[PDB]
Amino acid sequence: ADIIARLREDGIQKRVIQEGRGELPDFQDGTKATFHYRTLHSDDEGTVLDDSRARGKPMELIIGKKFKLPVWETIVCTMREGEIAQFLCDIKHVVLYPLVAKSLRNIAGHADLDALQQNPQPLIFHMEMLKVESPGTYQQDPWAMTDEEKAKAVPLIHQEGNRLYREGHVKEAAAKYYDAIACLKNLQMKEQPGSPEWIQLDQQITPLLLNYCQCKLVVEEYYEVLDHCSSILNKYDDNVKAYFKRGKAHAAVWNAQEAQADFAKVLELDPALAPVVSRELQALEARIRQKDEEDKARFRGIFS
Amino acid sequence: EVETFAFQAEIAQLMSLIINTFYSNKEIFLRELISNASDALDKIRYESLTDPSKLDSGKELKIDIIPNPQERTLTLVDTGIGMTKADLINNLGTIAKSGTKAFMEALQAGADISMIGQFGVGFYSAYLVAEKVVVITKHNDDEQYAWESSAGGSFTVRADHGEPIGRGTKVILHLKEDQTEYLEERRVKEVVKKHSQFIGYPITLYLEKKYIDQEELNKTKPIWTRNPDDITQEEYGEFYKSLTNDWEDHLAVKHFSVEGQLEFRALLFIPRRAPFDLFENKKKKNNIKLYVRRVFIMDSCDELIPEYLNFIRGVVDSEDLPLNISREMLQQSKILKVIRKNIVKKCLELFSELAEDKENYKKFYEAFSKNLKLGIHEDSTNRRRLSELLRYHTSQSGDEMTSLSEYVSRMKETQKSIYYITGESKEQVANSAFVERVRKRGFEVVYMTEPIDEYCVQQLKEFDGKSLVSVTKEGLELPEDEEEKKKMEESKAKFENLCKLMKEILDKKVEKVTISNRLVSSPCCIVTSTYGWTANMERIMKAQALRDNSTMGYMMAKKHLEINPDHPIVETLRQKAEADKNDKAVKDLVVLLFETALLSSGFSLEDPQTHSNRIYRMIKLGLGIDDEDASRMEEVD
Amino acid sequence: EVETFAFQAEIAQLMSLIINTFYSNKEIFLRELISNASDALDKIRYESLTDPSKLDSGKELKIDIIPNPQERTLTLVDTGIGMTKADLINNLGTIAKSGTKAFMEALQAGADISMIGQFGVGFYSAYLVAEKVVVITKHNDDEQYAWESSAGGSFTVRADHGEPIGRGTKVILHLKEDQTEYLEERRVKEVVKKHSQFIGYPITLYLEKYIDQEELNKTKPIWTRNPDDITQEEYGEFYKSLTNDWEDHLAVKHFSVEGQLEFRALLFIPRRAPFDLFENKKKKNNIKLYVRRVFIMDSCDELIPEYLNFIRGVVDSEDLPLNISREMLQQSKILKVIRKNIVKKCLELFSELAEDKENYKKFYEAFSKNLKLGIHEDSTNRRRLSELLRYHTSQSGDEMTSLSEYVSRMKETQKSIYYITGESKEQVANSAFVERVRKRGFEVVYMTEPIDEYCVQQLKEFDGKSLVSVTKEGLELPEDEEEKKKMEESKAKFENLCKLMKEILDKKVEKVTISNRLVSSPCCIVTSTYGWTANMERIMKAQALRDNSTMGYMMAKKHLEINPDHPIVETLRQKAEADKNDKAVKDLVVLLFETALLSSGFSLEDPQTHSNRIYRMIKLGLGI
Amino acid sequence: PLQPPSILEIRTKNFIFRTKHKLDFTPIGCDAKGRIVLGYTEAELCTRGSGYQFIHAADMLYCAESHIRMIKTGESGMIVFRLLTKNNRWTWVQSNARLLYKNGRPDYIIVTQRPLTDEEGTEHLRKRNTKLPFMFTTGEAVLYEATNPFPAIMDPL
């Protein structure tokens, strides 16, 4: 109805600079807004403690799930698209400021934003809004989605990861597979273990985790693959692909004794393709023989 | 109507109770009879003080024991005051009536006499071994009488004519057919030594060896009744040798007394060497004994002194302690706690004052440092005082052992901690890699090279306000400068990749790989977390027979691997890891270095044969001894 | 003439003796009073057996305890037989006069009654805590009287006209100022639990919280019943009530003895070992001794050996002679006989449990340490205890076997049992000592506890066959004539190399010889027949309280054994024959000795020398 | 002369005790030392909740993860966390829970634990892993929402 008259009575005092274009967004419970921040002390010393548009790092913020600090939400409520304004706030709104910017810039021992910890005061906030989209249009990021919708979202993530992998890109496929795996695992906490639903959820993560291990092995990160493969084999102990990947990693990191055993387990569990396992064994033997010859040359009489 | 009555007794049942249920050992009958004789001699001697005519019937006060296997009788003759007919009837014939108590009560207050006997039932312990008892008495104011009975509800008194007893009493026991063990020399000697050792009059024994041989059996005297100032060290040595049968004399002695509501006198000796079976727990310890009026009551039983002070030999004598009916126990057992407190305090004072004489404290420490350290591990009240009696080798000291006080007085200004290392031997610790930097910087390190030192330092947290810091634990801090801090930070930043790789290779053997701050010439070392067993403590605890192997996981510490940035091997490893992180040689070198550090840091390998095989492989090398579905399998699902 | 008098007694001093020097604990007055009440209840129950009309003043047989902090009094009410005026004057007013003994003697032979109390002095323990004692009584064929005294040498009896009581006695103690702790709930509950837990009649405490009444002795003494009439469920309930354990028992032995010495015993085995089994600071109260269901003393190491400390149970007797305080036995030599019987029956129980497999596996996992301690300590039962031992073996895989199974599986050419002691199973299994012994097909027992090292000191032979360590010098094996010819040829071939090695390692070993137990490793260190092994040395060095100043004289001497068929040894022999003073052979011999030392269970005096050797080799390998 | 091997020992005491728990970690039966460590009686332990009431709020996720691992493999490794006493205090404990099977199915849980001091507990907490591998990435979850319904293990029954 009338929010401008509401802000003043709430304690804050704000002044508009350039009116934005378009109508006022609904800003219901759950909404994504993109905008820039540039915060500077009001009168104590006048300097700038944190800035985004000064260097060009947008500060994304979805409106109203919990967002401990309620000042930012109320501030962006009365701003439309392309509206630039500056203003200050009372100490009460921003008393707990250090619990916001401690990492929002580092994740991407502060001496500026820690100044408030020893002497609070009102602080100026220079805002600039660019875009504001209600839920439904923008691709919701995985952490903000609801369980019932993330359940149906996982397959699209799986397919996007596969499509990226086949094209010839890995790091991005790894990121997509990681997001899908985390999304599935968070759901399992919603369900009791051992029950049919927990095992049902577990059934659809092993393929994704196998793809993740495949990509990790391709990017030459072997030690990581071993942990995930061991986690899979401990519960199942009947995965041919899991044993194959674990043995390949063991061979890659010179763990011949275990690589051979895992390859033998694959052979006894999947006798179909002997040529591939034998080829891997031969390659491992050739590499080991080469290194043995080099070491024999290296020592060659150190005593006398 | 309200009637009024007086209590009564059943004499037959009372006698049965006295004979059967009062005394557990049948040997204390001799103690009771000797106590009675001593009381009689005290009475006659005191009476003769103000009337020397009372000794006209003999001037010597003594006690004699005369076995007679032919008649199967035992005689105990004394030349004491003796009993009149009326006294005989009133004292021997009445249960719970004591002539000694009445004599003491009628005595003028403020006189020197301390007589055993206050209950009036001791004489009837003689029927523990005797089927019939005959008493022949003779007083200075009466004729000689004979008192006879079998504890069968009545006794007879008659005038006795025969060999005249000049003055005193004679008790003849007709031993039972199964109690003839008390007619032999060994048994009587042992009983008298155990119970009546310090009676104030000679106790002669007469035996057939023919002729009548004699032995005093109580030659030694209770020197603890004399003033401590009057006694010379030679007399103390003689008493100690007589008490402990030691061919050499004591090392130190303490002679104190306590006055007040509870009073006693004590004599504490420190032996010159540790007995060969000091700590064995199947010994029934009797190091300190308790006496009441020079009569043995009970052994220590770890009630009069803590277990870690069990090497002290001594005596505790009191005048007024409430005893049980069988005088081998105390009523109000809580008095033993007060006695123990006093004894412990005085023992600590003795140790503290003996520390000034360095030469003798050297011997005492070499003998009983184990006991001192065990006391530190056990005693919480006296921990601070005990900590000041410890002596250790240090890096700065030579072949001598120094105290912690000297260490504190010799510290640097910046130093805030006491540095120590525990190991298996002095040679092992002195040459370890944990102490290179500490010793190079000029700090002092305390060497503790015995298993008991682990238990000792578990409870010793700080001395004189300064904490104790182990050089084998993670988190060692030394005083530093700004340039050193900058160098450490730069080194740490330069070696992050190598640390990550080394942690990856040692997947589960270590908990962390860091940059060392205590190494000089070694490449690496292994230290343990702040909380949990050190390598030495873990080694000692895993070798204990009576240890619960299920609890090991709760008490062990995590291993941290630390590497030296200023060593050629480490620099070579860093360069190789930068060149190619999956190199085989790097992996083999990392594993070999970890195993060598594990062996040198005090740990034991899970399988030593793996290390042996690696070494053998190196030796042999030195000597020169010797389809289309494929693409489908590993693409997607 | 010959006179003749009668023994007299002086009453005042006698009362002082009874009140001041008989009992060392003031809490036993409750025990004495409850014992008296129980005897009275037994008397009335027995009397009503033939004349049911006797129980016309009441049918319930119970005991009551009623604190009264306001008046500072404690009251013990019972519904027993009571006593008349004549009894009040005689029984309660005469010292050393027992009415219970007279009642028991009046009975005919084989009576179904066993009453506590035969001395006639227990009632006066009430004056340990009380200033004045009032006794209200009421017999069937008599009025109701009040007895009063203050231990002042006289007592009064008057006909009471207060609130009537149908039958029985009511003792009122006017507590002293300093003895008011006995009016509290916790103290009374604790005392009753400690002393009169198993009295045969309900004991109820009345408290203000409306006067709530609470029964104190809920559990019955099941040991009086017959063993075969008791189910395991009630056995377990009794065990849980006794030991306070939230779990059930594993096994139970319930037996009896007859003759001059008669007692009944219940013995239980816990399912799990307490975490403070060997904790020194604990009282030996695992087994309690009772006489006529009244607690006497705890085990105190005289009722059972120290290696059976995990046994929980009860020993009850009817005719043990006690002392006046009833806190110990006269002629304490009976405890030896009782202990002998208990040990025999515990061993019998273990043997019976051995028949079951899973239960015995649980029991062994819990108390094998105690069994081995018993083997080390006890010599009479060593043979019986040796058949309860279970060990891992080279041929048993993951399970554990017994020595008899080992002997039944022996080969006709095998005269001895072979074992090895070490730090862990992995270390011993992959040891260099067991290479050939396992290759030939023989069987080796694995021992991996320090208590095992203690144990083998006493277990010299089993079933007539001796035990042999594979870590000691002169290991004997069956052989063929060709093997001996080859051994002699090898010795002749390697004499010179052995001589040179013994020269190089002066005063580090006492011999260098040719091994007969190595297959794949080049060398190993063994100890002489006399002295400690490496494992025993490791265990002894770690004893904090042991005097190790003279340990050098008990340490065994170490012999180095060489493998004739190893490439390294052959190359060493060739190098030595070529040039015996070379540095290569010296360094190689030193390195081999140190590595064998490390792998054989010993510890180097200075590990830093070995570490520096390895570091030098690494540096040379890296080219630095 | 010289002495033969004996079994002289120092006999160190410890404060490790066992407890019996239901599938939902409801304490049903405790060792004697446990009563001293956690002020309670026989009845209160049963009629106080379901175990998760005892866990300190900060430690809830750690304990839930350990419970998941215990169910998956039958026993959780050592874990250090806080427990709720009758006096509302908190005591650090080092616990290791084990799952028992009666017939191919879980029956109850036996926990062996050791009380810790505040210093050792704080030390263990500091080093505690801040995150688990497949977390939700730095999506500012603890900033924007910071509200999760917690694992279904904790939901009563």
Ligand SMILES: Nc1ncnc2c1ncn2[C@@H]1O[C@H](COP(=O)(O)OP(=O)(O)O)[C@@H](O)[C@H]1O
């Ligand atoms: N040898 C003796 N000479 C003189 N009087 C004796 C002798 N033996 C016993 N009596 C007297 O007989 C009494 C027996 O008492 P006893 O049972 O010994 O208890 P207590 O020693 O406390 O008196 C003593 O009071 C003592 O006066």
Ligand SMILES: Nc1ncnc2c1ncn2[C@@H]1O[C@H](COP(=O)(O)OP(=O)(O)O)[C@@H](O)[C@H]1O
């Ligand atoms: N509560 C009671 N009811 C009936 N008779 C009692 C009671 N208490 C004591 N008496 C009688 O008074 C006597 C006192 O003896 P006591 O001190 O109990 O020794 P004891 O128990 O060995 O007889 C007993 O013999 C008993 O017959």
Ligand SMILES: O=C1Nc2ccccc2/C1=C1/Nc2ccccc2C1=O
């Ligand atoms: O170890 C405990 N001891 C206790 C004593 C009382 C109540 C709970 C617990 C313990 C729990 N260990 C746990 C492990 C995982 C999840 C939950 C839990 C617990 O509640």
Ligand code: MOO
């Ligand atoms: O001589 Mo007594 O009867 O023990 O006081």
Ligand code: MOO
């Ligand atoms: O009730 Mo008694 O007088 O201890 O046998």
Ligand SMILES: [Mg+2]
């Ligand atoms: Mg006497």
Ligand SMILES: [Mg+2]
């Ligand atoms: Mg009685």
